[PDB]
Amino acid sequence: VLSSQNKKAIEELGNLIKANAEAWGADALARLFELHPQTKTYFSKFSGFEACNEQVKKHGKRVMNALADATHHLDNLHLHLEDLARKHGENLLVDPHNFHLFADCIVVTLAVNLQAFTPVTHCAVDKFLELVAYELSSCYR
Amino acid sequence: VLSSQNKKAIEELGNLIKANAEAWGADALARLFELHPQTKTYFSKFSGFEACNEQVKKHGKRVMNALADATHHLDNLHLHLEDLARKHGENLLVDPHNFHLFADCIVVTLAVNLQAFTPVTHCAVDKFLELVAYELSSCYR
């Protein structure tokens, strides 16, 4: 699950993510494609991979909107993330390791945009993303 | 959770593990200490790390007995592994990565001792061990 201390910080962070979904999502994806170019192979339809690319902006908004949603369903994340797991696991064959590489990118996006990002807040987000990675990899079990 | 196909193979494997707990456990630990010597730092009390060492044999039996037990509690692994999680997470500060390194060693122990170890059986065991690793790391969330 998630610790009480970690649960609280996440509940509130979702409000911020939802509001800046596109800008943050686009930023997160651009870092992923930049740091790990092999991940571009999953996005065969995309024409560009910069944060300004409309496709990247549209997809980034959807990722962040999904994350904000999940913060409101921490006690039953399996049921909530079930479809996305099927999408990523069964359909796209997304390598579980990629979820972690992406989580590390999202954390930097948050550090660059949040007013403050203390070790405690960073810790809560890391454990939350670790939970998401685990659920999105469920189709492999 | 675990897939039906994967669940079945695991249920039966527990009977074999329980019966060969000491021999297999001792073998699994020896491989861990051999492949990753830095892991010996957790066992400050041990005098030797060979599979013939009585301490290694006593500890190996307990690990395997715990695993066999877990195969009979696949639908509520959190509740079953709770104490061991606290032991490994809160008390010993066992690096989550170590559980995976150890799982890879256990798989070889099984391949060397089982009559047959097909990719399908190997797959089920890998996902089962992945579940165990996740639960033993729960105190960090």
Added chain:
Amino acid sequence: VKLSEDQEHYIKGVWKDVDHKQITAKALERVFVVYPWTTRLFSKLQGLFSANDIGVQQHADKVQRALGEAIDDLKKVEINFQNLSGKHQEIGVDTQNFKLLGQTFMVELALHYKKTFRPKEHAAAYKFFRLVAEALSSNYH
């Protein structure tokens, strides 16, 4: 990473003993089943992932030849694998995958040698595959 004189001797010895292609083909079949996501970029195999399939057999011949080139000059592996490393990034394979093939290969070595595949032998093999994994991930840009 580097292997001691004893470890290098064992690895060359194993390579003279085993059937290069058959063991490699079985290692590939195992990686496809144990780690499902690995089949993603193997479109040329047209869904035929067994060791006895012609596609897998042809690919296995390529992989075993590369491993042999590594065993022949363990000191120049990183340099010799520069191209192949880049080749894998281009295709889109995650660096962690290299470790996974190393794992299924050791399981096949274990199934073949059984009880003679003791911790010392296992450690020599692991060290070899860790060197190969490093050389393939090194030239990722």
Added chain:
Amino acid sequence: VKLSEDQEHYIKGVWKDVDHKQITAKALERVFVVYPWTTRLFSKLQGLFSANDIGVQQHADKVQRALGEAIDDLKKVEINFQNLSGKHQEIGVDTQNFKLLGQTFMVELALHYKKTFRPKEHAAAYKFFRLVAEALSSNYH
């Protein structure tokens, strides 16, 4: 791994700009909180894990000096870090930990440079810490 001319320039530039010790001390404080298990072998710190604690400060001075030695000769890092690599294995630290410190360091770089820490800069930093991580894990026997 190796950095392009542009990436090496950025890294040397950052090292001239930031306060070596303070940023390193904050990176260590962050790793201890985000990844709790990392405090295990830091017994000399007697439970004081904050950036402003004398123990952390003294250790941070050692770590920053090593990083500076890497930045000074990016071509001979692996060779220069041979001893330090062995030193960490002896102590008992898991190789994956090196990547974790690299991550908290990039978060601190992000908090410092904010919006100027774009994907290109982030990629240069990641590539640098990946080279450092490799050099520290390379001499693990």
